[PDB]
Design a protein around this ligand. Structure first.
Ligand SMILES: Nc1ncnc2c1ncn2[C@@H]1O[C@H](COP(=O)(O)OP(=O)(O)O)[C@@H](O)[C@H]1O
Ligand SMILES: Nc1ncnc2c1ncn2[C@@H]1O[C@H](COP(=O)(O)OP(=O)(O)O)[C@@H](O)[C@H]1O
Ligand SMILES: Nc1ncnc2c1ncn2[C@@H]1O[C@H](COP(=O)(O)OP(=O)(O)O)[C@@H](O)[C@H]1O
Ligand SMILES: [Mg+2]
Lengths: 537, 526, 527, 74
């Protein structure tokens, strides 16, 4: 008679109501961590680890989910870090409210393919309207655009101070790693900034190290820990005793030739260490291993040798100091040449005190003048929060300098799109106009969440918010009310042009493209079959 | 991990707080509204609920379905009590009260998640309800030519729509004619105990009938009932409350005798006590005897020899209907029997309807009661037919004392959305998002008339909002044709107090769900 | 390996715990009573929220009154029971202000924790609270501005009863004020004792609150067992014996010795019952109400002589019927009633809300007793209006005992916060800190009124002290809309229970003092 | 989801809802036909003068061979 599957089958409006409650179970979590009045959470594990964070990606990655519609919204937050980097609480609330308003349409016996086709006409028109209603590029504002866009990202986190201490350190970090490319591409690789953590003084003592901050120790306590006018030798091979390979064995037939082979394992080893040290090299960085026999040659000659450094850290030092990453001997059948003209340069390599640990600093690197940020917090829970908040702040200034276009934040984009799409649904709307009209109400949840978390008036402040944006579209008298946002500290609509509340363009363009595409896949689960777990057979 | 005291809070109780509590109450009312959602409209199906004992009850009434779900949710019990009060006040407002009260919470469900302290929602719900119950009274039509054939036609149209959405398809013209004729035979009290609805298994719905008199089920008799033939052209009924047995003992009598000459005189006196009571029933014309107390083998054979009929162990609910049918009086003592206490009928026979025997009375013109015998093919079929009969009786019971009727279907629920949206555009403040949300919540009654049979319900609401804003105010949803139609001209009528008590009970239930902010449950459940 | 700490001096219990000191006993009693103050803080005021409380009997109670919530919550903390029994004494004394006790004594213990952790011990916070409590009873007669004396009729008490109604029924403040005005004034004893037990509530399930009314009489929920339901003369003979005859007491045994005594016993018993029913029919009686059962022979002659029978199974409802129609319950069998007959106007039956009721409706002589017939959509709604009805009857008994009133709505607690602070600054001692903390407990009572209205309590409490500059003494809170700009309470008419404010301050002070006296707690094993 | 809310609260409507069975779907009408056709296919072979009888065994072990449709289904 029925289906003889050994799992479970649920059809109809059961799964159509379960996917909305699965998406609302995720959105109601992250609704309390949006905007400058948002608050952080606690993520406690079974082993006892506590993670205090408010970013939309760190919470949903550590949180376990079971529903298939819940894994779509959790993987939607992971894509926002790679594509944009701060846009990762706002996408989850929009994509869940896109399913909440579309559930009210399919309960009115409206076909979901008209809602899918109605959402594509509203998503492509939202990108078209936001690209024709921008204020200015990065020429008029200058450095004031980079600082004000950085403070908007920090307002939802622990580094949202009233001053410009953390804002100036981010702009000075991205501007110091300007790496040009072919065909006129000024790239800004923000992954080259080594963000370090140390439980020390307050947040106002966060050092901006112009150069690189290596997270390693010297090793042997007989080397000079401060070298002025240093020459960095970046190399990746273990400075240990000469061990033969698997194909080579030592089969001796004469007992007199025994001790000459035993001394040869250290003579070939020390032959490399004398030709890399006679060329003026004082700092040697190694990703392999330097044993206790080879540490004597640096104490005797007065050189610094750092062992077991990361491979991702050696590439950031050799590119910034002009050093060449050498793995072995080379240069056309040469015995030991080392190409001594390709040594790195540094002004000062100094191991400072980082509150009961050792940290090596390189000052200005003499070739590229890179930057590294050492964070200072109260405990380890604040340092993990300060690292995530700084990494999201580095991604904001990266997209502004690459794509010179900013949009007003604080719900100013979602207020203008809530009224333009209602007029867009009336012109060319015959049967898909109800999906475009619900696309505007789903976008209004971003200024609605700012009024809930601020404990302000909800149905009056957003009603006063769209009152200025309606007059900016139907009354062409140059009212300039396209930048009207929210003042959550006062509870009144303010102008985000003069207040300095700036967000990048692709933090809302890619947010509206990812949330609309995720809402289509969850809208097509009218039939769902769940099989039994095959564990013990 | 937070609460670890030495002395706990109360015992172990959990309590939600704030905005997650209120959405938990609104979404709970949406689940219990699905059990009355598919039972609306003439194209609405019924539901079958089986309990733990295995008893099946198939019905579509809101007062029958919601009482068998065994709902233990605190907020969802509010929608069950308004379905019970609608059956107690009106009788046919049941599925519409539960579903409309759930829409009052779902239309404010995006509003309660974003601010909007609920004292503004309670004030807006009470304001829109008082304007809704006043526009019904100002538009409900009435007549000034009653006590004629036109008033009986008004009672028949309200009973056909009350018999709609039931298990009756083509028997609307047959059953609803009997419902109007049932309440017109009653007195000026309209008591529901003055009409017997008895279910006889076997026969179609066309085999049912409305007896002008009464009829009982012919309960357990004794030897002598195959005699006493059932042909009476003008009998008299003796309603009694006495025992006609030889063993009538007062349970405290000790008859101490001394000799054998007086011992036989006691046994002869015990037969003379019973035979003197039978001589009082005799010599008075009372050929039919009815008593709620049992009759032994002695008085059964005495009436068979004197060509008299009797019936013992009659239920007390049937003797009260028998007293108002024949116009007599129940006499406990047989010494005061006369012509003023006996009944009078014309046709009294014992038929064989459905296999079981039934002693029916007919022919009495001064009949203040009636009996509607139901014939069906199943026990659950006749229980639904009895439940559908009570909804048509309680509609026509209230229609006599208040003949103000309105249009059926979604005609009133759509035009109340017109008068409330026009009122919401004339007041400032936050009430434009609440009075207008109250008007959009009333549009689900024409939605469930269409969603149960397709009908393209999105396009049919654009025709309803355009017709009510242009011309008449009684345009609703046609069931046979997939179009809008004037329900007042199509004789789809319902009394005005059906929708007045529906809007009043749904608003007071919706104001109670939004007013509770904490729910504390004690774990002691024994 | 790992050692452990054993018992030291007096560990002799078999599973019981022990508390001693300030941190283990005194500070934990404060934090337990603070959780009850924060629980009922949301349900306090006219904008309070209801609470669906389920007891151990698995039934639902939804209300906003703090007295009926604590009766269903199974509280197990011992110091938390002291603030519950103090609120239960407010219901027994005046019947209103039970929640005022939880806010004031919850703030008295909370501010006492700030004094024990900064300063003086319990020997001076208790003595400091008692000085400010005696001074608080000297300002309350000075804050009386109006009185319930002139025109004691249904017009003046319709406005003086709105404050007790709007605190629990905000939208129905106009309908319930008129229903409590036509019931409490109609049972006036002509300058005597006002009994609150003479007002009953008949819950009839049906339509909404607009169809509720007050009937001058009593409404029961039983049947007739007869056909004489239309009674217009209404001469009621009330009996307490079972209306089935006169039986003996010890054993009871019919002794038959001949055939004549057996045949005449059944006919002689019917003639004996016939003479007793016709003895009360010749006296003009129409309604015969009994307490016990009624035999079939009594029902035979009740319908013959055309008299109505009423069955009352409850013995307490029979005594209320004697005060309704003015009769006397006779313990013996039916006599010729000389002067203890009842006299009503119309006794009939009607099925209202699918419930056949018996109504003893008085038409001309209206004032003997009153019964408010409440209508509701749910049974849970009618229990909440009944609590609001009983708060209106209990407020009418307060105005009988003392006709003085004080302006509520936050106006009284600010003036009590200003005068106690004036006494605290003029006290040259170390106990002046507890006097200043006693006035701040009155400051938190209009704070709960503003937090329940969605208004910021910092700007609300700042405007109250700014307009109380030594001569106003009447401005309270305007909770009708946001951005309040608060108005006068005498112009709005928000003033209630001066005697309620006199007892709620005294009970909450003695409750908070009794908690601070507890220094050592010895509990037993719960079983 | 079932038996849980989106805010983490337990979502209990009726008592013992985990051990309940509810079908609205499109197979609720299909389950009524397949249950009624198997009764009609059983009684199809016992129709007419060539209708074969059925052997009915009671709970007490009594065996009654019946052909009329009233006693078979009862
Ligand atoms: N000063 C401000 N005024 C108003 N709104 C602000 C201000 N600063 C930040 N916001 C709002 O707070 C929101 C924070 O979003 P966020 O959680 O950072 O997104 P994502 O998770 O993608 O990084 C932004 O959408 C922005 O509109
Ligand atoms: N002939 C008809 N045409 C259109 N609609 C009808 C017709 N007959 C009944 N209806 C609709 O069916 C609905 C049945 O409601 P019902 O379930 O009886 O309410 P309740 O449960 O309160 O008795 C009515 O609201 C009415 O509008
Ligand atoms: N119209 C009004 N305006 C302002 N405040 C009011 C109004 N009506 C009542 N209140 C306030 O609501 C509070 C209700 O207190 P209540 O809970 O009745 O105390 P109790 O529990 O002792 O009866 C009162 O203290 C009063 O100040
Ligand atoms: Mg009160």
């Amino acid at each position: 008679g029925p289906l003889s599957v050994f799992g479970d089958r649920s059809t109809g409006e059961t799964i159509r109501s379960q996917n909305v409650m699965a998406a609302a179970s995720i959105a109601n979590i992250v609704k309390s961590s949006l905007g400058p009045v948002g608050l952080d959470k606690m993520l406690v594990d079974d082993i006892g680890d506590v993670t205090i964070t408010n970013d939309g990606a760190t919470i949903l990655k550590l949180l376990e989910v079971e529903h298939p519609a819940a894994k779509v919204l959790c993987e939607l937050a992971d894509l926002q870090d790679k594509e944009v980097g701060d846009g990762t609480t706002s996408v989850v609330i929009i994509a869940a409210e896109l399913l909440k308003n579309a559930d009210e349409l399919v309960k009115q016996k409206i076909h979901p393919t008209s809602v899918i086709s109605g959402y594509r006409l509203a998503c492509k028109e939202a990108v078209r309207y936001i690209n024709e209603n921008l204020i200015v590029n990065t020429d008029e504002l200058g450095r004031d655009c980079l600082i004000n866009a950085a403070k908007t990202s920090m307002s939802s986190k622990i580094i949202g101070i009233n001053g410009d201490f953390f804002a100036n350190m981010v702009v000075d970090a991205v501007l110091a790693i300007k790496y040009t490319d072919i065909r006129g591409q000024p790239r800004y690789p923000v992954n080259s900034v080594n963000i370090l953590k140390a439980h020390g003084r307050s947040q106002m003592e966060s050092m901006l190290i112009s150069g690189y901050a290596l997270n390693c120790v010297v090793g042997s306590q007989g080397m000079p820990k401060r070298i002025v006018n240093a020459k960095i030798a970046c190399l990746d091979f273990s400075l240990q005793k000469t061990k033969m390979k698997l194909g080579v064995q030592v089969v001796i037939t004469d007992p007199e030739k025994l001790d000459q082979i035993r001394q040869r394992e250290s003579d070939i080893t020390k032959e490399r260490i004398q030709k890399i040290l006679a060329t003026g090299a004082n700092v040697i960085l190694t990703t392999g291993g330097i044993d206790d026999m080879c540490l004597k040659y640096f104490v005797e000659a007065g050189a610094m040798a750092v062992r077991r450094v990361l491979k991702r850290d050696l590439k950031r030092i050799a590119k910034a100091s002009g050093a060449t990453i050498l793995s072995t001997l080379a240069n056309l059948e040469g015995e030991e040449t080392f190409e001594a003209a390709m040594l790195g340069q540094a002004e000062e390599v100094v191991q400072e005190r980082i509150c009961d640990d050792e940290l090596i600093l390189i000052k200005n690197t003499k070739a590229r003048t890179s930057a590294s940020i050492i964070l200072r917090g109260a405990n380890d829970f604040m340092c993990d929060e300060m690292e995530r908040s700084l990494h999201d702040a580095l991604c904001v200034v990266k997209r502004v300098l690459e794509s010179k276009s900013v949009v007003p934040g604080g719900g100013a984009v979602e207020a203008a799109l809530s009224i333009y799409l209602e007029n867009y649904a009336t012109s060319m709307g015959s049967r898909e106009q109800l999906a475009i009209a619900e696309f505007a109400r789903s976008l209004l949840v971003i200024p609605n969440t700012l009024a809930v978390n601020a404990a302000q008036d909800s149905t009056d402040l957003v009603a006063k918010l769209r009152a200025f944006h309606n007059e900016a579209q139907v009354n062409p008298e140059r009212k300039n009310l396209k930048w009207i946002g929210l003042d959550l500290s006062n509870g009144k609509p303010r102008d985000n042009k003069q207040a300095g509340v700036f967000e990048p363009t692709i933090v809302k363009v890619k947010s509206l493209k990812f949330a609309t595409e995720a809402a289509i896949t969850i809208l097509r689960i009218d039939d769902l079959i769940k099989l039994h777990p095959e564990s013990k057979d | 991990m937070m609460p670890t005291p030495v002395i706990l809070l109360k015992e172990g109780t959990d309590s939600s707080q704030g905005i997650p509590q209120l959405v938990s109450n609104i979404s709970a009312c949406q689940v219990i509204a699905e059990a009355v959602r598919t039972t609306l409209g003439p194209r609405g199906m019924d539901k079958l609920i089986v309990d733990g004992r295995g008893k099946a009850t198939i019905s579509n009434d809101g007062a029958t379905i919601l009482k068998l779900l065994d709902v233990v949710h605190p907020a969802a019990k509010t929608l069950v009590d308004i379905a019970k009060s609608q059956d107690a006040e009106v009788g046919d407002g049941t599925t519409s009260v539960t579903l409309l009260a759930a829409e009052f919470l779902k239309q404010v469900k995006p509003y309660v998640e974003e601010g909007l302290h609920p004292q503004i929602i309670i004030r807006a719900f009470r304001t829109a309800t008082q304007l809704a119950v006043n526009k019904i009274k100002e538009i409900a039509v009435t007549v000034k030519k009653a006590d004629k054939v036109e008033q009986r036609k008004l009672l028949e149209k309200c009973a056909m729509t009350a018999l709609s959405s039931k298990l009756i398809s083509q028997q609307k013209a047959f059953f609803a004619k009997m419902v109007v004729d049932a309440v017109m035979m009653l007195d000026d009290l309209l008591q529901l105990k003055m009409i017997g609805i008895k279910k006889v298994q076997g026969g179609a719905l066309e085999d049912s009938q409305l007896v002008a008199g009464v009829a009982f089920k012919k309960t357990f008799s004794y030897a002598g009932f195959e005699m006493q033939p059932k042909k009476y052209h003008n009998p008299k009924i003796a309603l009694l409350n006495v025992e006609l047995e030889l063993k009538a003992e007062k349970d405290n009598a000790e008859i101490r005798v001394h000799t054998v000459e007086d011992y036989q005189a006691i046994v002869d006196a015990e037969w003379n006590i019973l035979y003197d009571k039978l001589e009082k029933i005799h010599h008075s014309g009372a050929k039919v005897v009815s008593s709620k107390l049992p009759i032994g083998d002695v008085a059964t054979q005495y009436f068979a020899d004197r060509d008299m009929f009797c019936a013992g162990r009659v239920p007390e609910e049937d003797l009260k209907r028998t007293m108002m049918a024949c116009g007599g009086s129940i006499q406990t003592s047989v010494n005061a029997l006369s012509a003023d206490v006996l009944g009078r009928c014309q046709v009294f026979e014992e038929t064989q309807i459905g296999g079981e025997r039934y002693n029916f009375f007919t022919g009495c013109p001064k009949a203040k009661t009636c009996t509607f015998i139901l014939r069906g093919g199943a026990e659950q079929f006749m229980e639904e037919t009895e439940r559908s009969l009570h909804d048509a009786i309680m509609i026509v019971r209230r229609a006599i004392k208040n003949d103000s009727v309105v249009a059926g279907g979604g005609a009133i629920e759509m035009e109340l959305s017109k008068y409330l949206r026009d009122y919401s555009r004339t007041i400032p403040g936050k009430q434009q998002l609440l009075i207008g949300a109250y008007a959009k919540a009333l549009e689900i009654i024409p939605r469930q008339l269409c969603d149960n049979a397709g009908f393209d319900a999105t396009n049919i609401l654009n025709k309803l909002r355009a017709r009510h804003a242009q011309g008449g105010t009684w345009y609703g949803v046609d069931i046979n044709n997939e179009d809008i139609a004037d329900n007042f001209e199509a004789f789809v009528w319902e009394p005005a107090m059906v929708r007045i008590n529906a809007l009043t009970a749904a608003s007071e239930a919706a104001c109670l769900i939004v007013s509770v902010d904490e729910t504390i449950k004690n774990p002691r459940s024994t | 390996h790992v050692p452990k700490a054993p018992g030291f001096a007096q560990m002799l219990k078999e599973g019981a715990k022990h508390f001693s000191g300030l941190e283990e006993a005194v500070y934990r009693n404060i934090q337990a009573c603070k959780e009850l103050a924060q629980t009922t803080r949301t349900a306090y005021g006219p904008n309070g929220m209801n609470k669906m409380v389920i007891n151990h009997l698995e039934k639902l109670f939804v209300t906003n009154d703090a007295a009926t919530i604590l009766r269903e919550l199974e509280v197990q903390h011992p110091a938390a029971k002291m603030i519950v029994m103090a609120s239960h004494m407010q219901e027994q004394e005046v019947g209103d202000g039970t929640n005022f006790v939880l806010v004031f004594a919850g703030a008295l213990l909370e501010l006492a924790e700030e004094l024990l952790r900064i300063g003086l011990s319990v020997s001076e916070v208790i003595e400091g609270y008692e000085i400010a409590c005696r001074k608080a009873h000297e300002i309350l007669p000075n804050l009386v501005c109006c009185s319930a004396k002139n025109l004691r009729d249904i017009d003046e008490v319709s406005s003086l009863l709105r404050t007790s109604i709007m605190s629990k029924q905000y939208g129905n403040e106009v309908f319930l004020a008129k229903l409590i005005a036509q019931a409490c004034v109609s049972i006036f004893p002509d300058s005597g004792h006002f009994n609150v037990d003479n007002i009953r509530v008949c819950k009839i399930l049906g339509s909404g609150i607009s169809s509720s009314s007050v009937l001058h009489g009593m409404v029961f929920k039983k049947e007739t067992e007869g056909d004489v339901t239309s009674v217009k003369d209404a001469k009621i003979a009330v009996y307490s014996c079972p209306f089935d005859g006169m039986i003996t007491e010890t054993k009871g045994t019919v002794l038959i010795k001949t055939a004549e005594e057996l045949m005449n016993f059944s006919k002689g018993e019917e003639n004996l019952m016939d003479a007793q029913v016709k003895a009360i029919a010749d006296t003009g009686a129409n309604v015969v109400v009994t307490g016990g059962k009624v035999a079939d022979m009594a029902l035979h002659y009740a319908n013959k002589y055309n008299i109505m029978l009423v069955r009352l199974n409850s013995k307490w409802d029979l005594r209320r019927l004697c005060k309704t129609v003015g009769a006397t319950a006779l313990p013996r069998l039916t006599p010729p009633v000389l002067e203890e007959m009842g006299h009503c106007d119309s006794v009939y039956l009607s099925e209202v809300g699918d419930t056949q009721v018996v109504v003893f409706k008085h038409e001309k002589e209206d004032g003997a007793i009153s019964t408010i017939v409440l209508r509701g959509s749910t049974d849970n709604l009618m229990d909440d209006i009944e609590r609001a009805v009983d708060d209106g009857v209990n407020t009418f008994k307060v105005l009988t005992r003392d006709k003085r009133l004080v302006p509520g709505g936050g106006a009284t607690e600010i003036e009590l916060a200003k005068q106690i602070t004036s006494y605290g600054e003029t006290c040259p001692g170390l106990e002046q800190y507890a006097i200043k903390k006693f006035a701040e407990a009155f400051e938190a009572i209009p704070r709960a009124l503003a937090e329940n209205s969605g208004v910021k309590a910092n700007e609300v409490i700042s405007k109250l002290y700014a307009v109380h500059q030594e001569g106003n003494k009447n401005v309270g809170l305007d909770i009708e809309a946001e951005v309040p700009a608060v108005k006068d309470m005498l112009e709005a008419g928000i003033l209630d229970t001066y005697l309620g404010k006199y007892w709620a301050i005294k009970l909450a002070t003695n409750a908070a003092v009794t908690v601070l006296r507890v220094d050592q707690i010895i509990m037993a094993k719960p079983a | 989801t079932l038996a849980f809310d989106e805010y983490g609260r337990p979502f209990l409507i009726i008592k013992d809802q985990d051990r309940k069975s509810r079908l609205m779907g499109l197979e609720a009408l299909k389950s009524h036909i397949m249950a009624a056709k198997a009764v009609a296919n059983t009684m199809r072979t016992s129709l007419g003068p060539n209708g074969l009888d059925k052997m009915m065994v009671d709970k007490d072990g009594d065996v009654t061979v019946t052909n009329d449709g009233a006693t078979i289904l009862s």
